[PDB]
Design a protein around this ligand. Structure first.
Ligand SMILES: *Cc1c(COP(=O)(O)O)cnc(C)c1O
Ligand SMILES: *Cc1c(COP(=O)(O)O)cnc(C)c1O
Ligand SMILES: O=C(O)CCc1c[nH]c2ccccc12
Lengths: 394, 388
């Protein structure tokens, strides 16, 4: 029977790394990586994280089945990390998930249950997984302008006109911060306007929060999510702890459902628990316990925030440097956006041909859409990247 | 929008858990003489070692780690593991493996029908209802003798068309505790082959029936007779790592080509659901399985659990016989696993819940592991004090 199965495409990423490894060039560079890499090209386990696992190993007496929708300690900690003082527990339903992706999948499942005719609006461009999941579910997908290929900034006017078309019950997917892949973000004033479009159209906002703490800071990066949560009655949030906690493989994330009233909240919480049960039953405990241990233990929370801020500042200095080199090499403003972008990714706005030229002539590898990982840069590589950009005519 | 959410029905077995002489005899978790679900020694040492060796938590394999896949396949199929034609998928618990299994099947056959045993693990029909898959049942539990109604089972299975899926429990049947013998398995293999049905084996209690290798005997028999089979495995119980959520789906194919399709579709299936599978539990399992010292101690501890329970069923059966002078409750000592269907009527079952405090599933499913020398006489007394 399994022969009638249709060939599904490879993960792609593996093929990407495949070409890189084959390259016999001594000084090749890889900015295609999608994970954080330190000065030595490694993805370190955060000190706080290693301390939490250690504590856990001494206090966990059993591994019996735990909470179906997650553990309270975790749900509360996450809700406070994201919403802060604005967390209206009475109207907030929480669901521990298998990573941010799990949260996203469940969010789409929940909304489709409440409304079969759900349509989704995604930015142009957006994380590829978004479109695939939705395509897999058979959900109708619509696009809204976002990346201005010329200024490498946000085409706000276009985004606005396109969102205006959304109607009652449609789902508008927004990245809370550090827009993957572009790196271009909305200002608090732009979020406020978007809020007005959402109130007007009656569309449900789904906020993908996977990089809180990699932009301007933990509180700063949650500003937009909070502005929306304050003005829009029903809001869906898909948080990930993969990056900001550096526990990618642990598969830790959560779906937050902000409801207009308690009755609805209980209806949402029940529906969410139902979703986990029918998919894989209980969610993975380990990562969720590393997270709640860090957030509840002052000593650990302090060292975690300290380390993350180190990461954030490191990447920022790197952006400033790259942009600086580019200013010397071109004698113009043009590449100033590199220092304006936030997150660990940035779209150079180079064409596929230019991307190919760079690889063949400079041995530098990046995603085909010219997306680069800032963390991959360094005092030695920046000079090379900068020169390449100018040389290929970007 | 969310206000249109239709209220969904809860999981009865876990419901009692919340509602809970207050003797717990429900949830299928193992418990020691002092009502505790301890962490296994080897598992604890595995975590300790992992804490020292792991230097990164970056994204890993989408279909699970190669070490985990190999070890698991060998644990289940032993020397019948033909990796060239076997695809493996690391999942979120055995439940995730079942779901993924149903998704893959339907993907390869939109007009798929699933046969389940009467009765079976409630979660089975639950998930299938959600997915909208046609569920049919085959006779299994012989209400009177508490054994298997084999003649009824064979008759119903023979009615399966090809392209249909048959859900069989590899061992330790939940909720009955009634299991097929190897000879009966060969019979089932005959039917499956003639009907062209795909067997989906739910293997959640390997090591709780008669032993690690013995409990897999049935699964291995089918793996050798049928060219294409799916096996949904769970590490929750036999490794005691319930909350880590770890198991795997094994897809056995007739050729390498089909195998590549399945593997591809399995990985794609993980990617669209939650991306990468949980690492921690998978790692504990592989570390244990590949570390001779660790596997040795794990087996020993699992043998202790298995023997202790058999010892308990024997004590209970004895008291039941010496409390009525009849071989009626003999089925108790015959059943395998941590469950056993007493065959008690719902009135009686619900009755004993309050004045007594003994919580057992509404269908008279009792977790033998909850019993103990102190509780046994009280339970036996209760059974006689009530109706049956
Ligand atoms: C990284 C990322 C995620 C995280 O996925 P996980 O399942 O947590 O690993 C989710 N959304 C976006 C846009 C991301 O960039
Ligand atoms: C325990 C069990 C499973 C799997 O449980 P997971 O917690 O998802 O590993 C599947 N089927 C049966 C019959 C079980 O008892
Ligand atoms: O009691 C059992 O059947 C095993 C534990 C159990 C109860 N409900 C469940 C739902 C999903 C996964 C495991 C379980």
């Amino acid at each position: 029977m399994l022969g009638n199965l249709k060939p599904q495409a490879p993960d792609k990423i593996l093929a990407l790394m495949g070409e890189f490894r084959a390259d016999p060039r001594q000084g090749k560079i890889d900015l295609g990586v999608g994970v954080y890499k330190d000065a030595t090209g490694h993805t370190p386990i955060m000190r706080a994280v290693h301390a939490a696992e250690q504590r856990m190993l001494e206090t966990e007496t059993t591994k019996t089945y735990a909470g179906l929708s997650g553990e309270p300690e975790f749900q509360k900690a996450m809700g406070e990390l994201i919403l802060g003082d604005g967390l209206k527990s009475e109207t907030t339903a929480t669901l521990a998930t298998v990573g941010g992706t799990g949260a996203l999948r469940q969010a789409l499942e929940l909304a489709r249950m409440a409304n079969p005719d759900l349509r989704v609006f995604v930015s142009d461009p957006t994380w590829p997984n978004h479109v695939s999941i939705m395509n897999f579910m058979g959900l109708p997908v619509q696009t809204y302008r976002y990346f201005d290929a010329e200024t490498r900034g946000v085409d706000f006017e276009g985004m606005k006109a396109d969102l205006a078309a959304a109607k009652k019950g449609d789902m508008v997917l927004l990245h809370g911060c550090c827009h993957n892949p572009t790196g271009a973000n909305l200002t608090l004033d732009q979020w406020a306007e978007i809020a007005s479009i959402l109130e007007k159209t009656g569309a449900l906002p789904l906020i993908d929060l996977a990089y809180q703490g990699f932009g301007d800071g933990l509180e700063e990066d949650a500003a937009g999510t909070r502005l929306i949560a304050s003005r829009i009655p029903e809001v869906l949030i898909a948080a990930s702890c993969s990056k900001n906690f550096g526990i990618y493989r642990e598969r830790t994330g959560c779906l937050l459902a902000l409801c207009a009233d308690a009755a609805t909240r209980e209806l949402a919480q029940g529906a969410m628990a139902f979703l986990n049960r029918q998919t894989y039953s209980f969610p993975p405990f380990h990562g969720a316990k590393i997270v709640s241990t860090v957030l509840t233990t002052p000593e650990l929370r302090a060292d975690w925030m300290a380390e993350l801020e180190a990461v954030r500042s490191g990447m920022l200095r790197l952006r400033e440097q790259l942009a600086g080199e580019l200013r010397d090499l071109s004698g113009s403003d043009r590449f100033g956006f590199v220092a304006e972008h936030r997150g660990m990714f940035s779209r150079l706005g180079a064409t596929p041909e230019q991307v190919k030229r760079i690889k063949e002539e400079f041995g530098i590898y990046m995603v085909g859409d010219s997306r680069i990982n800032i963390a991959g840069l360094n005092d030695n590589t920046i000079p090379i990247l900068a020169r390449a950009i100018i040389e290929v005519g970007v």
